[PDB]
Design a protein around this nucleic acid. Structure first.
Ligand SMILES: [Mg+2]
Ligand SMILES: [Mg+2]
Ligand SMILES: [Mg+2]
Ligand SMILES: [Mg+2]
Ligand SMILES: [Mg+2]
Lengths: 118, 51, 233, 57
RNA sequence: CGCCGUUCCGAAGGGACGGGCGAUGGCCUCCGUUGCCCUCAGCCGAUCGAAAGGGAGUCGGGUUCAGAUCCCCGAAUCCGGAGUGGCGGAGAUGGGCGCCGCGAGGCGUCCAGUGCGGUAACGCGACCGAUCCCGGAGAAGCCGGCGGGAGCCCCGGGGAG
RNA sequence: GCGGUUCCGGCGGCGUCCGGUGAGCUCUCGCUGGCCCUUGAAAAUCCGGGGGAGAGGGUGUAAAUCUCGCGCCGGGCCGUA
RNA sequence: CCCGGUGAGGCGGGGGGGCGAGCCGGGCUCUCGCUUCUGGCGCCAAGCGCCCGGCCGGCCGGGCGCGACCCGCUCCGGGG
């Protein structure tokens, strides 16, 4: 009715949400970073053996794109174990190494036997 | 870079609940806590702004 | 009975004093460029000198005439797309088992009719833009002796023909029961337009200063007249 | 303390139990109370004289 | 190809306490979420720009061939979240009148209660509150003198080698 | 000083004590001064205050609310020789 | 067409009101628009008038107007 401000601003108009006639992609893209992709293979060096026996820690080579949360969930589902924490580094050769510590109720040495590490 | 000092003067906004800070050239003899007056009907005193 | 706690608390809106109220600033708003443009174009058409050929379109029928003219024209509207289908289907049934009068619309159709003297009354919108589309029509109708009128709104002529807009429409024939109504309009319309054509085409428009300027001129002159009156006292 | 440490301190540690407390000094709170009171009295004094002068006029 | 320009020739807000109309659900009691309308709304310039500037919060011990304030042991701490965010404590729990009782107190009504201490500086464990507004911190050079605390050095003794 | 597989955070005894001093050196905290026709960043971010629109319960099974004490969950990404 | 200012916030004209002047109480010459003591405070309307809704004249709650004069064609100035 009246303008108590000297400024004209663009009035807010309705903005509809998209309702595509067709989907631009026929099917959703498959997940290329599933659990089998995230865990490549276990490390079996002298350091990795020390980690298993003394720190309750498995040592894995993992996809460089995987994060700690993804590593943790893959390890749990692949081997049905429980994970206390995960430490990661990227090696000078470009691979990502995961230091997965098991919960105190799991024995890494026992788990390593199931996986075939030892 | 400027020889003259500058005075920081605070006015009330006549249309909004605010304080307006201006930056004047400091006329010689003005002091902090002094009242200055600007407008057609301000009195002829050092530091006032008049037409 | 009044509660003694209530009281008046007036605000003093002098310079200084209390913050000013929220009054209407409409006059002082900074409008979008497109709003400033169309308003400044309205002012220019007042401020400049408008030639008679363009200024003639500011003279328009009064609402009373424009209502009678539009009620008569409502009886001869072109058939809509829908009801042309029914007429065609009815002819199909009739074939298995005359053109009535209608409005003629479009500046190209009306122009040919005026030149052929086949039009009886020409209605021209006052706000066609570009104006060159019809700027010549009032003078053409006068030359051919076709009564013409100027109506407010190309949208109103648009509604007659079931379209958004129409620059002009024309009566070519009417039913016998409406011949008197057309004659009454033509006589009134002819006096306002065709018989004043000499003064319409010599009558410039615009050339009016802004109110502040006019007021300034009025104040300046009034000083002299008062002094001139006080010259003799 | 550093400004982002104030977020984890209780309110009591960041102010004083007094009007403007924690933001204005005590000395200048006493002055503003007198100044506000004393100035508002002068408005009544000046208003009364104006009313009286108008009454005589 | 592009260039100038960075607030300057711009309808530059996609937000919100609250209110009213509906729609959906759930620990369906009533609350969320959600759509519209009303109301309110300066920031005034996208963005980038510092591994020495600003910027919350981690320390001691042990451990390897090579890593550690990152691993292990121990002891902490910041930020964010949870209203199915749980338990304490605070708000909080008082007084008048009328009955009963020797009293301790118990009942019925009527009123109060968004904490308290100090003359003060200010203190106490919290100690409601939005738009809006004011202010503080971040946030301030170089040089001199002097003083306090540390580490180191020095001096006099006890041990142990 | 004792043991072991003897490549065990192995196990034991004792000790880890009492004073002085300084324009000393280094760091730091603070007070006070001098110099400038030199006056020596900004922002993210955090806080307090002013106001009082509101909300909370009717004396209890108390409410709104709480920057108080506990308790519950999490902290991804890249660098690191 | 150009320049300056501003969050384009009260511009022009008229009305209304106040102090003065002066002609024989009224009309006008003509001016003014409510802040100057103090290193306070100042928004998000009080009041009034008129309508309306819900519940049981009484409660609870809304809308409009005045307050905050009206009409206007360039935001206001400076150039041109
Ligand atoms: Mg950046
Ligand atoms: Mg940095
Ligand atoms: Mg840690
Ligand atoms: Mg308060
Ligand atoms: Mg290193």
């Amino acid at each position: 009715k009246i303008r108590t401000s000297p400024t004209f601003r663009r009035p807010k108009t309705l903005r509809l949400r998209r309702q595509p006639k067709y989907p631009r992609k026929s099917a959703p893209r498959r997940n290329k970073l599933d659990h089998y992709a995230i865990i490549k293979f276990p490390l079996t060096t002298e350091s990795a053996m020390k980690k298993i026996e003394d720190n309750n820690t498995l040592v894995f080579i993992v996809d460089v794109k995987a994060n700690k949360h993804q590593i943790k969930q893959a390890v749990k589902k692949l081997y049905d174990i429980d994970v206390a924490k995960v430490n990661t580094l990227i090696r000078p050769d470009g691979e990502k190494k995961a230091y997965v510590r098991l919960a105190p109720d799991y024995d890494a040495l026992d788990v390593a036997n199931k996986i075939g590490i030892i | 870079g400027r020889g003259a000092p500058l005075a920081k003067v605070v006015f009330r906004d006549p249309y909004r609940f605010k304080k307006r800070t201006e930056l004047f050239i400091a006329a010689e003899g003005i002091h902090t806590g002094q009242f200055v007056y600007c407008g057609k009907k301000a009195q002829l005193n050092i530091g006032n702004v008049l037409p | 009975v009044v509660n003694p706690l209530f009281e008046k608390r007036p605000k003093n809106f002098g310079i200084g004093q209390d913050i000013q109220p929220k009054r209407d600033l409409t006059r002082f708003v900074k409008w979008p460029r497109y709003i400033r443009l169309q308003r400044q174009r309205a002012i220019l058409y007042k401020r400049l000198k408008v030639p008679p050929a363009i200024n003639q379109f500011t003279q328009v029928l009064d609402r009373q005439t424009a209502t009678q003219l539009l009620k008569l024209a409502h009886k001869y509207r072109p058939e809509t797309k829908q009801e042309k289908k029914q007429r065609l289907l009815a002819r199909a049934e009739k074939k298995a088992a005359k053109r009535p009068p209608v409005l003629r619309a479009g500046v190209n159709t009306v122009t040919t009719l005026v030149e052929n003297k086949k039009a009886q009354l020409v209605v021209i919108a006052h706000d066609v833009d570009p104006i060159e589309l019809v700027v010549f029509l009032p003078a053409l109708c006068r030359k051919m002796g076709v009564p013409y009128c100027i109506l407010k709104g190309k949208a109103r002529l648009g509604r007659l023909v079931h379209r958004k807009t129409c620059t002009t429409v024309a009566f070519t024939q009417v039913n016998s029961e409406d011949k008197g109504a057309l004659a009454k309009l033509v006589e009134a319309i002819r006096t306002n337009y065709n018989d004043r054509y000499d003064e319409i085409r010599r009558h410039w428009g615009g050339n009016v200063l802004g109110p502040k300027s006019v007021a300034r001129i009025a104040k300046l002159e009034k000083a002299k007249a008062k002094e001139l009156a006080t010259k003799l006292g | 303390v550093r400004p982002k440490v104030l977020m984890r301190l209780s309110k009591t540690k960041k102010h004083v139990s007094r009007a403007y407390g924690g933001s204005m000094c005590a000395k200048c709170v006493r002055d503003r109370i007198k100044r506000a009171f004393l100035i508002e009295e002068q408005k009544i004094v000046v208003k009364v004289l104006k009313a009286q002068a108008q009454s005589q006029k």
